[PDB]
């Protein structure tokens, strides 16, 4: 449990270290992907 | 040369912003590790509450009050780690906002200097052409 909890603290430090830099455009790209998915559902409604 | 001086200043700023990325990555690890600590302390507080429920089922009020005192100690310790976490969260965001501001300032400074250098070189070249074209031909015609 001592070794495992030290690896949990290493995973919290790793999760901070990834999360603290990773502010990106990609969230707005996922909003464009949801808009494109909405166009494919409108094309499916047109086919129906 | 001011061009070499401002390029070196921008290079020094790359070292400083890389140290600020290291400070963000450190602070990210501290907030994640202190979250992990309070998360496991609150899970142990549930285990000690269940130890009190078993003691109360057996009629051992002495063991139940001791187990509840362990629950109290663990939830107070998790509140101490949540208080420290709040300091790591505000520091993490402060370093992040300072990094975004520093990167923007470097980019603007370098591009404004680059266009000013190009305009200054054209201005001196135009002035040099006025000095060479302005003197010639007149002394040639007078000498002839």
Swiss-Prot record, chain B:
Disruption phenotype: Essential, it cannot be completely disrupted. Cells with very low levels of protein have no ordered thylakoids, are barely green and are non-photosynthetic. Residues 3-133 form a coiled coil. It is a peripheral membrane protein. It comes from the Bacteria. Its main location: membrane. Keywords: Cell inner membrane, Cell membrane, Coiled coil, Membrane. Required for thylakoid formation. Belongs to the PspA/Vipp/IM30 family. This is Membrane-associated protein Vipp1.
């Amino acid at each position: 449990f001592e070794r495992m909890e030290n690896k949990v603290l290493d995973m919290e430090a790793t999760s901070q270290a990834a999360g603290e830099l990773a502010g990106f455009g990609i969230e707005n790209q996922f909003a464009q992907l949801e808009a494109s998915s909405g166009v494919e559902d409108e094309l499916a409604a047109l086919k129906a | 040369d001011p061009e070499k001086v401002l390029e070196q200043a921008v290079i020094d700023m790359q070292e400083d912003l890389v140290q600020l990325r290291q400070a963000v990555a450190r602070t990210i690890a501290e907030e994640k590790r202190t979250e992990q600590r309070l998360n496991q302390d609150t899970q142990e507080a549930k285990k000690w509450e269940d130890r009190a429920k078993l003691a109360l089922t057996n009629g051992e009020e002495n063991l139940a009050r001791e187990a509840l005192a362990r629950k109290k100690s663990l939830t107070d310790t998790a509140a101490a780690y949540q208080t420290q976490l709040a300091q790591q969260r505000t520091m993490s965001e402060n370093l992040r906002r300072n990094l975004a501001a520093l990167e923007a300032k470097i980019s603007e400074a370098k591009t404004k200097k680059n266009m000013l250098q190009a305009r200054a070189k054209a201005a001196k070249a135009n002035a040099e052409l006025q000095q060479t074209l302005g003197g010639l031909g007149t002394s040639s015609a007078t000498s002839a």
